[PDB]
Structures are given as structure tokens and as C-alpha cells.
Amino acid sequence: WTATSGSCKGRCFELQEVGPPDCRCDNLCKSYSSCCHDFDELCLKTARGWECTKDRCGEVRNEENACHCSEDCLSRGDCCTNYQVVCKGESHWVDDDCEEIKVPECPAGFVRPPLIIFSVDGFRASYMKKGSKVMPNIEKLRSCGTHAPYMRPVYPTKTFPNLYTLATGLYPESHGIVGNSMYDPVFDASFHLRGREKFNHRWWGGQPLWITATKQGVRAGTFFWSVSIPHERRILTILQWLSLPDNERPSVYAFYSEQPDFSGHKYGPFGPEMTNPLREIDKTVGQLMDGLKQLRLHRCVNVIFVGDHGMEDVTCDRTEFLSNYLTNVDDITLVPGTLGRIRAKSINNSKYDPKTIIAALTCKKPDQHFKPYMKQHLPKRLHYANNRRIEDIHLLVDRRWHVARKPLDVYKKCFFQGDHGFDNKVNSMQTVFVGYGPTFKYRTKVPPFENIELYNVMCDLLGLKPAPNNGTHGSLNHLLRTNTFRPTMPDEVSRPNYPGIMYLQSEFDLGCTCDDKVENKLEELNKRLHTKGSTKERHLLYGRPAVLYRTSYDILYHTDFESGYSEIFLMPLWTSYTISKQAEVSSIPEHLTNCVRPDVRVSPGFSQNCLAYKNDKQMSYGFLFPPYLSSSPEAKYDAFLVTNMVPMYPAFKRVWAYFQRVLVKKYASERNGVNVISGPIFDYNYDGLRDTEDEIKQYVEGSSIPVPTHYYSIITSCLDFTQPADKCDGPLSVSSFILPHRPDNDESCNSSEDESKWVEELMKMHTARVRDIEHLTGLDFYRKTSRSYSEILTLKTYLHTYESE
Ligand SMILES: *[C@@H]1O[C@H](CO)[C@@H](O[C@@H]2O[C@H](CO)[C@@H](O[C@@H]3O[C@H](CO[C@H]4O[C@H](CO)[C@@H](O)[C@H](O[C@H]5O[C@H](CO)[C@@H](O)[C@H](O)[C@@H]5O[C@H]5O[C@H](CO)[C@@H](O)[C@H](O)[C@@H]5O)[C@@H]4O)[C@@H](O)[C@H](O[C@H]4O[C@H](CO)[C@@H](O)[C@H](O)[C@@H]4O[C@H]4O[C@H](CO)[C@@H](O)[C@H](O)[C@@H]4O)[C@@H]3O)[C@H](O)[C@H]2NC(C)=O)[C@H](O)[C@H]1NC(C)=O
Ligand SMILES: O=C(Nc1ccccc1)c1cc(S(=O)(=O)N2CCCCC2)c(Cl)cc1Cl
Ligand SMILES: [Ca+2]
Ligand SMILES: [Cl-]
Ligand code: NA
Ligand code: NA
Ligand SMILES: [Zn+2]
């Protein structure tokens, strides 16, 4: 109950929120049924519209008008945004040449440049080029400030997950807003866009920018606007707040637009009806910038123009129906649309079984436009699993498509021509970023980056210390003129051992055999130097990775590769090798097919054994440095060392063998040499973080050899590909992957065919950032390069997406 009989007199859009049953005058009251009786009248004035005209110039202040053109309006801070243009012969901000803002030019009393976040829903990245003729204010921000060709949203590419990621720097799985619709089984509550439950604080995790600012003594405007408050009024309110006294004035502000998303749903991303909503957004930007110029703040404020997601063409006839796959369709709840989430309709039903649901949804139709997943098998790059609100069964829906439970659901809900929510690597889902202001660079283009990074930068822009988040702080330093954050490399926690020859062959009883007792004074001194790290500068190009947790491990040197061998997990954490453009692929000789050799540098007790693999009917083994790429028949023996061996399902060996036999060499030809670092990942609790040994759920039968959940590789070369990977003078180029270690290839519908028809497609799907691999392994790569650390941070956040332009 609200006693809505108090007044909003002088309280319009108050920044602090009052405790009911006192009525509220903040820009949230509408949504709570709690506005004072006189809110509309006093706070939502509209008399005479939004623009000064010639005859209103110097008028007598009439307090009923929406905005003012009277003489005193500037010092009252409530002029219409075009006042100076109409009544003082000023020019519009968009008609002025841009001039570098080298330093903040702020009125006295400003202790820091304010930050204004202008967020636009559904603003697809290509609108910047395609709509450029009708968006002159946005185009001026873009060309004069710092801009990216696009900004990658988070998955799912829905509105609240992304806005809250912008505000917190967190993956939806960590902040908790994992969709536009959700069920929390601990609360036993649901969350929908309509309604009031979305306002309960228990849904919203992490620490959003407005709370970060408040806790550190920076005042914030609101980050939420009631849908009925028109855009002109939101601008005028921000401009009014900017005129408060030094002690009351916020330092950070947010504007939000429902457009062009609202229209994109009805008409499609490029429907002819879309030109007008782009015109109108641009006009709103014009009003803000003219408003800032009037207050002499247009060379003082940092402005971020940022989208939450793009928009794709989607119609009702492109709907796949679960009723065409399942007979039990009434025992399930589907969260539908551009992604699928499935749970049991009732937890009393113990005859509900996720395994048979997945099987009934897997490769059932020739052109199937979705793919089912246990959430833990989703591409690690999506970071979409570690939250009780994310259902165990997920469907990744193809771009342009919908999934629904039954046809009745679609026609008893064609309405729409556009939607979003798809995989965040999809081009149509990309959105925009422009930074304009004293703290951003002048006329600078930066490479595409992910919206998880912005929270750190907004904290930098405001002199705040960011709460712990998923950005990599310093990876966006190149956007900024000043205020950069000077990060330091994390300290190595465990130093390695460097074992020499310490064990006789006959101390090993591992059940391993090798045809290798076939017999020099030149070439024994040679092989000794190789084992001491003579070729290490060839194969370890950027230094050895640092181990950032407490563990016991050995560096092992070889002619063709170097490894960091874990005595705890009985395999390498990392293996590093360089393959030059000239290198040749050979095969495994027949006498060596099943050869595994003891490593006399490493004790029996810290080794794998062949017998476990023999006894384990499901589990076979592969090698991290591939025998196929050995530099010589004699160096090939090193590849069969028990310390280069890792556990692999036969189904996964098809993938691995193709990557190692065909793809590595392909990349080295295309890229002019590559450096490769490969290894195992253990993420049994799917939190995106390295497992400790007591978290391992599966071992090679009858042994202590833990089974990886994934295998990674990091493939580095010279960005200037006229220089070979091993002799590169400037910036690097990287692509990486985290392949799921699965006992079947059910994920690849074409897997019964030749690996050349499906393997590379699978790897592309599981593309990753080096930074994803660092979280999963506790390692830190690129420790010794000739590049600045900020540049390396940017490289570590890079994702190779395999989309076209
Ligand atoms: C992306 O960045 C983020 C932020 O840096 C990373 O997430 C962090 O990961 C940390 C490591 O896992 C984690 O630290 C844990 O914190 C526990 C305290 O949790 C509270 O405090 C934090 C900080 O204020 C707060 O944010 C938390 O809020 C979570 O929970 C509520 C819901 O309950 C949500 O509203 C909120 O959104 C958030 O949810 C998310 O996090 C939790 C995990 O905390 C997930 O379960 C959710 O699904 C969701 O993703 C909390 O209010 C603390 O208790 C933990 O400590 C246990 O484990 C350690 C190991 O060191 C042990 O030593 C401790 O003693 C303790 O163990 C005891 O409890 C165990 C579990 O009950 C038990 O098994 C043992 O036997 C012991 O008795 C731990 O320190 C931190 O909370 C999150 N922060 C956030 C915001 O998510 C994330 O990893 C990054 N992602 C990637 C890929 O890099
Ligand atoms: O992050 C948000 N806005 C946003 C706007 C621009 C740029 C980035 C983010 C956001 C804030 C609110 S809230 O402030 O009202 N709130 C949050 C926590 C307590 C419950 C009610 C709500 Cl309900 C929804 C969103 Cl999406
Ligand atoms: Ca883990
Ligand atoms: Cl959703
Ligand atoms: Na086996
Ligand atoms: Na298959
Ligand atoms: Zn939308």
C-alpha cells in the first residue's frame, strides 16, 4: 500500500528513493504503482512540446511548459535543448567541426568529467554504416571519438542479460540474469519482463556500476527509465541533474532507448520502417549534445554510445516444434524462442529422463535448425552453465529460427519479423560501441571487443576500483587517452623442477612396450643438448607459461617440443612446439604403432601405465606433441614417451588425429609457421575454472590417471605473416580452441563421414580466447615477448569467430 496523497512538489525525479507508504517521485514509481497523485502534472509536463521557436524567445517563464525559452532558463538549467540555437544564434553541436579534446574543459566545481552511458536496445553493428546517412549526430560521435567496428554481446543475446553484463562486467551465469525469463529452484520463484518480480533484489548478483560508484562516494543517476517516460524527458532530466550543486550532482548517468529493438521485432532488422526509428535516436543524441554544449559540458563529459545486442530476420514459419520429435511433449516445460531451455514439467515425475530427451532431439531431421546440449557440453566460450537457473538441457538454435514446444504455442500466443537471442558469435547479433570525450582517444578505431570489458573501463573513467569481474583489466587501455590502469603480470606460484636422467628402464613396470632397441660420437652430444634445452628458443617462443597455483611439476625438454609435466595429474599441463612453413608431415612407422616408452627423467610412481588403457575398454590414448610432425626419424622416439601421453576416447581420437595430422600443417602453411601450445583441461563442475584434484569425477579404469573434460590448443604466429612465426618482430596473431573430450561424436551430425567434412567445423564452434584457457588451467601465457603487457592482454581476450565480414 502507498498513501499516494503526498506531493512531488520540488521533488521531481529525486535521486534518493523514499520508504513507502510515503509516495515516490523517482523515475521508477510508475512501475511500482507508487507515484504521488501529482507526479504526471508536476514531473511529466508536456505543454508546448520540446523545442524553442522564434516567438518563444525571451518569453515570460511559464512553469507549465515542458521546457523553457525564457532568459533565466540557463541558470535554472531547464531550457529546451535548442534554446541557444533558436534564441542566441548558436550552432547545433552536429554542425561544428570536431576538435580534439586534449583535456577536460569543465565548469568550476567539477572534480571529474561526468560519464554518460547512452544505451540503445537492438542496435545492430552494421546500422553504423547502413544507416549513416540518417544519423548525423551518431556519425559525428563515431568518427570524432573512439569506435569499434562492432562489440560482441554475451550469450544469450537478450536485453536484460546484456544490460546487466554492461553494468557488472560479469557473465550472465555469474550475475544471475541468465535470460529474459527464468525459474530459480532454490527460491521456487519465476522471473519475467512483465511484472514486479524482476524488481526483487535477489535475482540480481554481482556489483553493478551504480553501487560501485555509491560505495566509493561517487553519486549516480538512475539506470532505469519507466517505459512511458518519453525520451525528450529523460534527456531533460539528465541535463537538469547536471545543473545540481557540486555536492548533489551525480557523476554517472544512463539513458536507455527501447528503439530500434521495438521496431526491429515488428519489421525485421532492415525493414523500410526501420529508417525512422534510427532518425529518432539520432535526434535524441542531437538533443543531448546540444544540451551539453549549452551547459558548456560538451568538451567535459565522456559519452558512451553502446548497444546491448543486434537483431536478425526471424519469422513464424521458421519454427521447429518439439512435438515433431518427442511423444512425451506434455511432461516438459520449454523456455522457447531463439534459444531453448528444457526442464521436467513436474519434479514428482521420476520417469522423466534428460538422456532420452537429448537422444530424441539429436540429428533427427536432415536440416534440423537447432542442436541439443547438456549445458556442460555447450562451447566453453559461451560461459553458460554455472547457475541453477540454467536448465540442464539447452538448445542452440540456428540463426533465423525459433524453437517452440507445440504449434498451438505460436498461433495461440504472423506477428514478428525480427528477433535476437542467438549464439553471441553470430554477425547479426553484434552491436556497437563509440566512446567520445576528454578521456577517450581522438579519431581512433579499435578492434572488436566484448562487452564484459566495459565495466572496468567505466570504473577507470570514474576513478573507481572495480569489483571482481570477468573483464581483463588493461585489455581496453588502447581506447583511452589517459586514466589507463597499469596492470602487472600475476606472480608464478610454483616453480618447476628440471629433472635429469634418474631412473633405469627396468625400474618401470607399466606394461608398455616399444620396438626401440635399435642402435655415435657426434649425435650423442647432440641429443644430450636437446634434452638440456638447446632447441628451447625454437619451441618456446613467448617464455614458459607460469603456473599460478601450488603444485608439483617438471619441465621436460626434447628436440621437437617442450612440456610442463604434472606429477599430480600424471600428464603435461602444457606442451609447446613450433611448426615452420617448411616442416614435413611423416607418419608413424609400423614398428612403432603401439609403442610407449618410459621417461627416465620421471619416476614410475609419477607416470601413466599402459595396462590401465588395456583394461579400460572405453578409454584409449593420444599424444600432445603429434608423432606425425617429428623433425627426424630419431626425434620421433621422443613423441612416444609416456610423459607425452594423455587419455582419449576413440571417438575423440578421430578429432585429435585430424587436427594434428592435417590441420597443424595447414595452418603453418597459411600463417608462415605456427607456435602450438596444447594440453588437457579438467572442468567437472563446469564453473570455467581449473579443477583441483579432489574435483575429478573420472579416472582411467583402475588407475589414478584423471580424464580431461576438454583439450585446448593455442596457435600463435606473426600478425605480419611475411615474417615466420619463430622470427617475428612485431604484433602476434592467435587463434585457440577448447574441444570437449567426448566419448561420442553425437554433436557432429556428419561424423560418420570423413573427418575433412566435420572436424574443422567442430573446432570452429569451440573457438576460445587464450583468457578462457587461463581460467581453466591456472596458467598464464605470453610471459616473455617483446610487446607491451596491455597489448598482450588484448591478444589474450581476442576470439577468432569464423564469421564473414
Ligand atoms: C567471473 O567473475 C566472477 C567474480 O570474480 C567469478 O565468480 C566468483 O568466483 C569465486 C570463486 O568461485 C566465488 O568465490 C566464492 O564465494 C563464496 C561467497 O559467495 C558470496 O559472496 C560473493 C562475493 O560478495 C557473492 O558475489 C556471491 O553471490 C553469488 O551467489 C548468489 C546466489 O546464492 C547470487 O546472487 C550471485 O549472483 C552469485 O552467484 C554466482 O556465484 C556462486 C558462487 O559463489 C554460484 O554458485 C552461482 O551459480 C552464481 O554463478 C555470494 O553471496 C564463498 O562461500 C566460496 O567459498 C567456498 O569455497 C572455497 C574455495 O576457496 C573454500 O575455501 C571456502 O571455505 C568455501 O567452501 C565452503 O563452502 C563450500 C560451498 O558451499 C563447501 O563445499 C565447502 O565444504 C566449504 O565449507 C567462494 O570463495 C565468488 O562468489 C564468485 N563471485 C560472483 C559474483 O559470482 C567467476 O569465477 C568468473 N568466471 C570466470 C570463468 O572466470
Ligand atoms: O542494468 C540495468 N540497466 C542498465 C541501463 C543502461 C546500461 C547498463 C545497465 C537495469 C537496472 C534495473 S534497476 O536499477 O531497476 N534494478 C537493478 C537491481 C535491483 C533491481 C532493480 C532493472 Cl529492473 C533492469 C536493468 Cl536491465
Ligand atoms: Ca572447475
Ligand atoms: Cl530467455
Ligand atoms: Na582401452
Ligand atoms: Na555424429
Ligand atoms: Zn528485443
Swiss-Prot record:
Protein name per its UniProtKB record: Autotaxin
Consequence of substituting residue 261 to N: Abolishes lysophospholipase D activity
Catalytic activity of the protein: a 1-O-alkyl-sn-glycero-3-phosphoethanolamine + H2O = a 1-O-alkyl-sn-glycero-3-phosphate + ethanolamine + H(+); a 1-acyl-sn-glycero-3-phosphoethanolamine + H2O = a 1-acyl-sn-glycero-3-phosphate + ethanolamine + H(+); 1-(9Z-octadecenoyl)-sn-glycero-3-phosphoethanolamine + H2O = 1-(9Z-octadecenoyl)-sn-glycero-3-phosphate + ethanolamine + H(+); a 1-O-alkyl-sn-glycero-3-phosphocholine + H2O = a 1-O-alkyl-sn-glycero-3-phosphate + choline + H(+)
Co-factor(s): Zn(2+); Ca(2+)
Known glycosylation sites: 3, 348, 360, 470, 750
Major subcellular site: secreted
Cell attachment site, short sequence motif: residues: 76-78
Tissue note: Abundantly expressed in cerebrum and cerebellum. Localized in secretory epithelial cells in the brain and the eye including choroid plexus epithelial cells, ciliary epithelial cells, iris pigment epithelial cells, and retinal pigment cells.
Domain of life where this protein originates: Eukaryota
Co-factor note (free text): Binds 2 Zn(2+) ions per subunit. Binds 1 Ca(2+) ion per subunit.
Gene: Enpp2
